[PDB]
Every structure is written in C-alpha cells, then in structure tokens.
Amino acid sequence: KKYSIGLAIGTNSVGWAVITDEYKVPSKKFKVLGNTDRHSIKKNLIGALLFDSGETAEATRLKRTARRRYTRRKNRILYLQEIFSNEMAKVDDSFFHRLEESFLVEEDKKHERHPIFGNIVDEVAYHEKYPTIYHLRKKLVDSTDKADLRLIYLALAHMIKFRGHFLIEGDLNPDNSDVDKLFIQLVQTYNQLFEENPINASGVDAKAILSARLSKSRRLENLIAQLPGEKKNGLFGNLIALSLGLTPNFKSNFDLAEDTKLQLSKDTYDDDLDNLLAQIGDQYADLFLAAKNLSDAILLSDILRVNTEITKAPLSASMIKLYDEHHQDLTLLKALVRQQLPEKYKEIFFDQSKNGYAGYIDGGASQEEFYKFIKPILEKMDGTEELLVKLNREDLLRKQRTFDNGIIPHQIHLGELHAILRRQEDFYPFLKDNREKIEKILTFRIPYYVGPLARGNSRFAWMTRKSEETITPWNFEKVVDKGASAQSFIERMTNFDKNLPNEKVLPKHSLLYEYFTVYNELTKVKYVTEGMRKPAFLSGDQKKAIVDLLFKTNRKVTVKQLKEDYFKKIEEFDSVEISGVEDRFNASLGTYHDLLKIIKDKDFLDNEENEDILEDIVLTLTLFEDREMIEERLKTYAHLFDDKVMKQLKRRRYTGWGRLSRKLINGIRDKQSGKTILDFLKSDGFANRNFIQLIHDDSLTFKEDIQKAQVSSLHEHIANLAGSPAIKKGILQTVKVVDELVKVMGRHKPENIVIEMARQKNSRERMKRIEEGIKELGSQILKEHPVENTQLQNEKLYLYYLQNGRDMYVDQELDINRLSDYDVDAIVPQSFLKDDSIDNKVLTRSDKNRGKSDNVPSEEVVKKMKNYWRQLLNAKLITQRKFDNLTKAERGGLSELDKAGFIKRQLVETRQITKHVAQILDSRMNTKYDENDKLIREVKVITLKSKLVSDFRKDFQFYKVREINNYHHAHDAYLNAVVGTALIKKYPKLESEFVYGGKATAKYFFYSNIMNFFKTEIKRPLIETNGETGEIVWDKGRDFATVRKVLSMPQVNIVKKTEVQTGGFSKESILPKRNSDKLIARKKDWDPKKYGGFDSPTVAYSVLVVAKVEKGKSKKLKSVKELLGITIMERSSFEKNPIDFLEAKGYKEVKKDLIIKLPKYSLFELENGRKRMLASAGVLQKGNELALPSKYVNFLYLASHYEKPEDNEQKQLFVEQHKHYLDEIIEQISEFSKRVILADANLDKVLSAYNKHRDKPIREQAENIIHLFTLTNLGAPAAFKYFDTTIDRKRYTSTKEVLDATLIHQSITGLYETRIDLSQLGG
RNA sequence: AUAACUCAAUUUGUAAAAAAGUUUUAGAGCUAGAAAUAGCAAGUUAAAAUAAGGCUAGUCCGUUAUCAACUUGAAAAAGUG
DNA sequence: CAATACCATTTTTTACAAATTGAGTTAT
DNA sequence: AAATGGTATTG
C-alpha cells in the first residue's frame, strides 16, 4: 500500500518520483486511449514536466502605458483642430483633411498631395523660407505681422505634439542675460565674508566656461583653473558645483558631523539648506542666494545656446543655429573632400549602405555611427582643424530632432506657444478667446494618483467622478473627484490590520503609531545599580518622565543619554547598567519633533483633547504628495494655526504605512482593567507586558477579541504569493502533478511528500555603480585604466574596480595585470555560508591576509582597514550588509552559536516561498479531523535544500551531467524522496526542522556529520536502524544498488507542457514596401505593397485541416490535409467561426469534426520510436531523449573534471582505464542520431572532428563529448562546437511527416496517454 | 516556526510623463544622352501610424497569469484509466 | 527540395503599495 | 539578452 513522493521544483521543470518502502520506484500498466492498436503500456513512476518560463507583467504594462500615451497625444491635436475648425474652414476647408491623409500615396488621396497649401508653388516656397519647423516657430513668436492660420496651427501643434518633460514644478523664465554678472554677484558676496583669501575674479569668462560644449562636472575644473589659489573640492568650488547640479560632501568646509550634500534642483533643498545654516549662521545664506541667481541662467545652458535678449524663442533659435552650422560645415566638407579625397566623395554622400553622410541622413546610421565612420577621414585631411574639435564636443552635423532633446522641459515649448498666441490674438479673436484653452492642452497631464479616466470598464482604474460627463483638460478639476481618487490610489494598495482585519493600518509616521513603538521597546528595558538584588522594570511614572524629557527633546535618545540625562540627573545613580536597548532606541518620536519644530507649541502636541486632529494631519500628509491637495484638506485646521506654519506644514510630507490599526493600538479594551494595549504599554505594574504578550495573555480579553474579528481557489491562491511569476508557475504545476500522482496511486495519499526548489543588463548596473562610486571617491582610476561595460562581468576585474584598485585586507595597491596571481576570499567563508554574490566576495593579493580561515576577518584587519571600508560604504562600492560582515570580529566575531546556525541553514530551508508550497501541500493532503476535533496528519511534507542530494550524488558517485538529457530533474526528485524519507526514519528528532507543522559545538558537530549514517567509514555497519523503534533506514549493501538501478532506468516520463502562444502579434519592425504576401497591413486600408508593414507573426496554434482546394482554370476540387498556423492576430476570428475563416483561406468542404488544436510542443511519434514536437505550423523540434547508461555518465563526469585525496588515484585511474568508453559513447550518439535526429551532414562532421582530435587529453575529449549532446538534446536544434569545428543547427522545416504520424496526447505526468493515428483521418 | 520595531538590499504589481526609432507622403532636382548611363546639385524638416482592432464608446480595453485527451460546463472546474 | 545566412523597437523620468533576506532589540 | 522561428537567397 504505502508510498512516498519526491518533487524537484524549478522554473522550467518539476521532477517527480514515486518510491515505496525499499526506496524502489514502482512500475505499472496504464490504459492507452484513441485509435492505435496499442490498448496499454508499462510506465516507471519517475518523470518530469518541462515548460517555457512564465513571465513578469512588466513588458505588458510598459506597452499598455505607451498605448495610453498614444491615444492621449492624438486627442491633444484633436482638441486643437476642434478650436481651429470653424476659422480654418474659412481660410482653407481641407487643410486638416490632408494632414490626416499625408501618409497615403498620391493615388489614394482625396486632396492635392501638397499638405500645407494644397499646391506645389506655395509649398516649395514655404520649405526654402522655413527649412525647419523651428525657423517658423521663431518667426511666429518674434514677428508682429498677421500670420497664416495654417502656419499658426502647425507651430502650435508641433509644440503641443512634442511638448517636452514634466519634471520641473511651476513657472520658468530664460535669464542667460547675465551668466557673466550673476556669477560676479557670487564672488563679491563670498569676497565680503572670506575677506582673508579674496578670490581674484576679473570676471574672465563666467559666461563661456560654465556653459561650454563639454560637460557640467568638467566645466567646474575649468573655472577653478582660471581662479588661482582654490581647491575645486573647496568652499568656492562647492558653491559652483551646486550652481551646476553636482552634490559636494560639504562637511570638510565647516568641521561637521556627517557628509552634508545638497542639490539646488531637489524640493528637499528649501528645508535642507536650513539644516546647514543652523550650523554656520543665517549670515551666509547670501552665498546660497547668489548660488541660485547663477544656478537659474546655467540650468538650461546645455539646450538653449542663444543670448535670449534678441528673441523670445531661444529654443527654436538654438535649433536654427544647429541647422545653419550643419549647412556651413557640410558645404565645407563637400569642398574639402573634392579638393583632397575626390575618390571617397561618392561613398560618403551617395552610398547609404556605408555610415557616411548619406548613411546618416537617408540610411539608418546614428549621430554616433556617423562620427565614428568619418573621424578617420576628417584627420587624414588638413582642413578639419576646427571641424574635428566640433565632432568631439558632439556639435558636428547635428539634426534638430535627436536622442538628447530628452532635457527640454515642457515650460520651454510653452514659452514659444504662449508667445505666438500673444502675437496672433491681436488679429484672430478666437485665439484671444481660447488662448487659455489651447495652453491647457500643452500643460494638462493626468496625475499619477488618478490613473486611467475610465468609466466602469478598466480593471486598472480607481478614479471617482463628482459627475458623469466627458473629461477634458478644461473640466478635469470640476468632473474628477481628485481627493477621493488621490486617496484610493493609496488605500486600494495598503494593508488591513491582520489582527482587526476590517481596520486599515495607521500611517508609519502617525503620532499614535510612534508612541506605541517606544513604549513597546521601553516597557522591556531594565536597569541596575549596586544595592539592587535583581535588575527591575521601568515603572509607569518612570517611562513617562523618560518619554516627556528625552524622547520629546531628541529625535534619537542614546543609551548614554538615558544613563546620564535621566538616572544621574534625576535618579542619582552615578553608575547604572541597563538591558534591552543596545546602543540607541530603535523607536523614536520622529513625528513629535518634525511637528514641534514647525508647529512651534508643546502645550498643543502634549494635549490629549486634540488627538483625533493631529492623527488626521499625519493621515493627510501620508496619503497625499500634491502640496496643493494637502493645503486644501489642511485648510479646515486654519483657525487652530498661525499662517506662517501652514507654509511649513503643507510641505511636511510623510511616506510609509504601519502594520497595525488605531482600534488595536488604543481603541479596543481589556474587559477587566478597561485599558487599551497602549495603556498597558504605558503602565503594567511589575509585569511590563509587550504588545505580543498582551495579545497572547489569557488573563486579558485581547486574545479572544482578536479571535472573534478573524475571517476565512488554488489558481488564485498561488498567484497571490510573493515570488517571481516564473517560480509561481513551477509551484502551481507541482500541486497538479501531486494531484495526478495521488490518482495513479488509487486515491491513497502518500506517507510523505519531499519538496525542494532552486535559486548588458547587469553590465550597465555595474559600470553605473563603478562610475558613481569613484566619481564620489574622486579617484583618477578610470582615466588611468578605462573600461567598457561588459568585461566588468569578470568578477576579478569588477571587484578590483569596486576596491579602487587596492587590496581589501592589507592597504597595498593591486597590480591590474596580476589578477591571475590573486585570490577571491569569501568574507563569511564558504565552510559556513554558500553565498557567491559580490556581497560576500573580496579581492586580495593572498586570501591569508584575512588571517584565520575558521572565522570572519581578524580584529587586526578590521581596525587597520575599517576607515577605507566606510570610504567604499559611502561610495556604494560595498553595501551596509558587506561592511557589517567585514567588521564582525570587533563586535565579538562569529560565535560558535552563529556558526552552528550557518551549517543548520545549509540543510533546513528558510525561504518563505518554499514554506508556502509545503503549507499548500500539507493543507491540501491533511483535511480530516478526529473525534476530539484536532487535524489528523495523514501526510508529512518534508522540505530539503538542494545541497543534501548534490552532496549525496558526489559522495556515492550518482553524478549528473545536466547536458545529457532532461532525466536529471526526475533523478533529483527520486534522490530527494529517498534522502528525505531515510533522514526522518533515522532521526525523528529532525521532523521539527524538515516536516511542516559547548551547546553550539555539539549541534554544529551533529549537523556537519548528520548524513554519515549513509557512509561505512568515518566504524558503522551495513544495516542501519532507528535506535528507539528499530525500523530499517538503509541496507547499505543492497540499497545504493536500488538507487543505481532507478538512475539506470531508460524509461523516464518527460513531458513538455503544450502551450497556446500569446503576446505580441509579430516582430514590431515597420518594414518598407516590397511585393511579398508576408507583409501585414498596419491599418485595414494600408496595402503593404504600397506602405510596408510587418513580416513575422507568431502562430498562436496550428490546426489540422482536412478539406479540398480549387486547382487550375477549371477550379477542379482536390483533397488536402495540412497544418494551418492560426496567428495570434487571426485567432479570435478563427475561434468565432471556425469554418467561414478556413473557407475565406481557400479550403472547401472543410470536415469540421476532424479539426485538431495543435499548440506549440504537441508531440508526434513517427517510425523507429522517433518523435517530433510541433514548434509551429511549418517547423518541428527534436522529440526524443537520449538515455545514456549510468556507466558512461560517470566516466564523462570524472573525465570532464580531472581537476577534482587518496581517492583521486582510484577516481583518476578509472578514467585512463576506460579510454575506450569514448568510442562506445560516440557510437551511442551515432545509433541515436542516425535513428531519430536524421542530420546526415552534421553527424559526418562530428564523426570526423572526433576521430581528428583522438590524440588529445581524455579531459579535453570529455568536455567536448558533453558539447555533442546538443546534437541529440530534446528541443529546437541549436549550434555547438566540437573543439574548433562548429556544427550549425540542422532544422526541421516541414510538418508534412506528422500528418500521417501518431499524435500522442500526454497527461501532466505522462502516465495517461491518448494516441491518435493521423493516417486514419485524411479522407 | 511567529509578531512589532531598526537599518540596508532585493523582488513584485500599478499609474502618469518624456525623447528617439521605423513606416508612407510632402519638401519641382539640373544638364548631356535614343537608351544604358554619366556629370553635378541637394540632404538637417513635417505630417500621419505605432500592435490589426474591439464595444462596453471610456481621453476605455487590446502582449502578464491560466491551457493534455475524452464526457460535462459560457466559464471556472468536475467526472474518466 | 537542402544548406546557408540574417534578423529580432530603444532609451528616459516621476509617484506609490506590498513582500522578502538578513544584520540587530523585545517577545508568543 | 539569447534563442529560434520567419524570411529570403542560393545551389
């Protein structure tokens, strides 16, 4: 009867195995359904499910969000055309019709092909008069002359259409009138205070140097160069840093506590300056007044590059300069190339294919790809003197529309938009009467806290309407309830009190929430002086004066402060030792301080009779981020407060939510005492009970009242876990294999389920962290050893850069060409912890400079190096986590208790996800209750870490070569079943730690050697028993034997999950027109032979048609049987009317009741047990698994790594003994590949390659056999090298063979099969 | 194994915005030549599209999750060896 | 037909909630 | 960011 289940949960596989008492995996006979002459079959009960990874929702979200951007922009232009409609009709009554149809070829147009003026003469004139839209924008803001309404419309729409960013708050004037003189206010203002060291400002080029071709950061160097006697990381260089945008550590300058860096563009600034002027005197905020005064003019000096005075359109103006420069520079290049390099000319100005000018303009070639091409050419030429300097500044042959217009803020565009409207309203009454409407089209933007402006049909939407009626930029305030919405943007995402679940958690920053937080910490602090028997609790009256005096005076109260400023100065205990708070209090009344600073009244804060209000001010400050919406919900408390203080309060924003409600903390009462949880926290006699205590104390009513308030699908339940969708698929799927396994085993539940789980992109992150770290350190190491951002994947190199080219342990400089000669020491060593992240890795010359292997780095090191570790800590070149580990010896080091914990954790799974799995399964298997009404545990769910079985394999030579076939997942699921059951059969003490439901040295010893009852020598006999019960746990002579024979089994149930494909319709590339029945219409009317489209759709699923097709002039019907791929785009109509779809496709008399859905991976058996999986309507995949014998597996293992004590003779010799296992392994690929692969050319190439490399080492030949298994791997064909010969993939490019094959429909285990012969369907 | 707090790092989900890219058209190409073709002149800008589309008609929705077969269900999901 | 080869939309900002891992304090 | 099905070209 009795059996167990093993599972191995991955992202692309669940391995499963069924085992019985003797660790044997049984075999059974299962029915075989459908129409073959096979009615049944034998199956070993070991297998795996394979699947393509499930995916994150992000891609889908990003496309959705852009979709909405598109439909909104379209409506901006529509809002504008509607305003223009009635007056544009009088000037030219088809203008908007022939913008709408500009894209159509001349023969699909209703109107004249010339869009603006609807005739050629006037259109040619327009373009030579205004080469760029920028020429026209400028003209229309500067000229006073009445303008063509069409030329007005075009300037407004292009400002409204490409309208720049919403990242600066509020209004904006261009003042670059005095970058010369705004700077020269700063130097007399600083030269008034620092009269000792007066900066020699002759104002030599303040205008130029800040605001030059090259960067901001660089240009500071170039000003402090033309000022003599001045550190650039010094007070005048610090002010100028800020004036640009860079942040300086500013600490040095004034002798202060912490690194103090501002950016004058952050909103954080207003307040942050005053944090510093509180130190140095409000008598030097005129050094940060003359700072903004130049910071204004310089903000925009990278875009705008025209002295504004001479234009109100400095953006369009600059653009015109880029053009004019582009014209003058090009005409020069065209002279030079023709006097100096005539041969090349053609290539550079005609041949698009190459990245010359033609390639830049009419080819597909980047501003960058261009520059690269012609740097070679420009300098093999004595004329490019001033023209090559332009290339390096990136100022050469610039377009106006480019990657770097990212920076233009919407206010700039609004500047010119507003200007034009001021001009032409003087002549167009409707522009006067709609100036504000039109501007609101450019300006309005739905708030992130409002989301889609839906009406009952967006599962994304939360917005409320004060009124049903259409929302427009102009009626949004009056129709959207912005507060209701601003609130539910948050409330729909925030927790309910897990204890009182109809209650919403308080703001993290609520005054009440912070009170609860200290009293909980403070209630379990205890103290001692001499003359006291025991240490006592703090009392009620004691906690109050500590709260009243220290907590409401300092943000942080340090333990020093509690000792000195309390026990000495009130309690008169000159020496007091205290337990429960270790350096400073975790808890703090941060909100009491932030408020009393701004509100300025302790008598109001401390007054209990106005609590509800203060709780509604912090709720208003936490919910909302829109300083305006705050003000509106804060205005009702304007009687109670000073006007100067709403100024402060409105800005006092807060962020974060608690885990507990007001009702719990301070509403709900103990029946007896009538006292709230916070009441007990404030005073609880001599018991001083915690939060967690009061909640579990049967003498109190909290325990049962929480029991009262507590309340009550699978598919749903799994998708609500916190893990990667990729793991959440493996999760669901395993539950489904376990449900099927329980059925094959006759509804009988298992004795046990043993689960276990596994553990350019990160090349930009690293270089971005490397730059910012050194840029912060001010190190010249990237000047001295420049690096792309793709070699920093070499962990030795990356660590070298993350350590500023220094040894992490000794304070030597690290030679960057001797990383070969150097070591990567784990901080917490490998012995204790399996972390391979950079958080535990450290590059040193030798690893022995940490000191002793058997602990954290020496105290020696920790005190010598610490200073430099914090340099890297501030730099973000290490984490607080890394830094804490590195230093641990100074806080005692790795305690024998820590060490045990680290070897226990090598064996017991912590991961919260794997626990949920174990729980899901436990709660799913164990559903019955006994007479007394307690849950009967039929099934035991045992959680193992991978390391156990990985060891076990390495320890009794059950080696896995992952690349041989998909069997290893099933193998691990078996080994997890046996090692699982065997471990709790020997040690029922360990069900505590694996089943769901001097002290350190011993524990440590036990765990280190736990798995020894499998070994014979460390002494121990063949037969192993439980001491107490005397069960059998391992017939060591006979039981490994059964493991061998299970792993040697060739018939393992592999199943690839068949999957209807979903996602994007096709490749996204909008291809040019060609005559080709592959191009796909981007819109109904856009015939792609004229307009281009898409070429490369995804088949959602293939379908088997048996029908007839017309043939010849005659239309004489002929019978067809083939696959038609149904495209993702086609699918919904195919499904709507299966016939009318296929009939419209060509097919006739389509036999409706023979159509078969064949999603991707649908499996087919041909001849010789050769099988193929569908990849598409036209492409097959390798369907067979190659079942290499055990003996060859292990030989390939040991061979591949000869880099492996006295056992390395016996293991290393086996290899040289069985050199002829190679020929025998090659022959076994050949028999296989000849029978099922059918790649005649590729087998010939591997055969030759092999025979050609036979005089090479046994190691080098095993590394490369291990490559050949790609030839034979289940799945899509793929390339691989045998040594230096590549064998490109032999693909399956027709599905015709499967139409007469056997379709095999598999259950999820693959044990239940329906088999269809397609030879019996085709008429 | 669990709770609250503190700090750091991570991952998941949502909303609002921006800049390019690509596509067709418009920006009279000239001269010599029967033509092939040659010489030359030009180039930087715009419009419109950006999943086909869909009804629920919103400034909404349209790429995630879920899916052997048979029987039963709109479905979810149950039954079946 | 087979062998062969080339191709795949990209970047950027702001606002927010949750869970999880792991170094601490207090506990059931 | 591969990997692998769409696509075209060619032998």
Author numbering: 3 to 714, 719 to 765, 774 to 1011, 1030 to 1050, 1059 to 1244, 1249 to 1367
Quoted from the paper:
When the RNA-guided Cas9 endonuclease is in complex with a mature CRISPR RNA (crRNA) and a transactivating crRNA (tracrRNA) or a chimeric single-guide RNA (sgRNA), Cas9 is capable of cleaving any genomic locus in a programmable manner when a protospacer adjacent motif (PAM) is present. The HNH-like nuclease (HNH) and RuvC-like nuclease (RuvC) domains in the NUC lobe cleave the target DNA strand (complementary to the guide RNA) and the nontarget DNA strand, respectively, while the C-terminal domain (CTD) is involved in the PAM interaction and contributes to the DNA target specificity. The REC lobe is composed of three REC domains (REC1-3) and plays a role in the recognition of guide RNA–target DNA heteroduplexes and cognate sgRNA scaffolds.
Recently, the SpCas9 variant xCas9, which harbors A262T/R324L/S409I/E480K/E543D/M694I/E1219V mutations, was evolved to possess broad PAM compatibility (5ʹ-NG-3ʹ, 5ʹ-GAA-3ʹ, and 5ʹ-GAT-3ʹ) and substantially lower genome-wide off-target activity than WT SpCas9. After screening various DNA substrates, we successfully determined the structures of xCas9 in complex with an 83-nucleotide (nt) sgRNA, a 28-nt target DNA strand, and a 12-nt nontarget strand containing different PAM sequences, TGG, CGG, TGA and TGC, at resolutions of 2.90 Å, 2.70 Å, 3.20 Å, and 3.01 Å, respectively. Six of the seven mutated residues are located in the REC lobe, including A262T in the REC1 domain; R324L, S409I, and E480K in the REC2 domain; as well as E543D and M694I in the REC3 domain; additionally, the mutation E1219V is located in the CTD domain. Intriguingly, our study revealed that xCas9 adopts a unique two-mode PAM recognition mechanism. xCas9 utilizes the same strategy as WT SpCas9 to recognize canonical NGG PAMs. Intriguingly, in the structures of xCas9 in complex with canonical PAMs (TGG and CGG), the conformations of R1333 and R1335 are similar to those observed in the structure of WT SpCas9 in complex with NGG PAMs, demonstrating that xCas9 utilizes distinct modes for the recognition of different PAMs. In this work, we discovered that xCas9 in complex with canonical NGG PAMs adopted the same configuration as WT SpCas9. This result implies that the enhanced DNA specificity of xCas9 may not result from the REC lobe conformational rearrangement but is likely the result of the mutations of residues that weaken the interactions between SpCas9 and the DNA substrate.
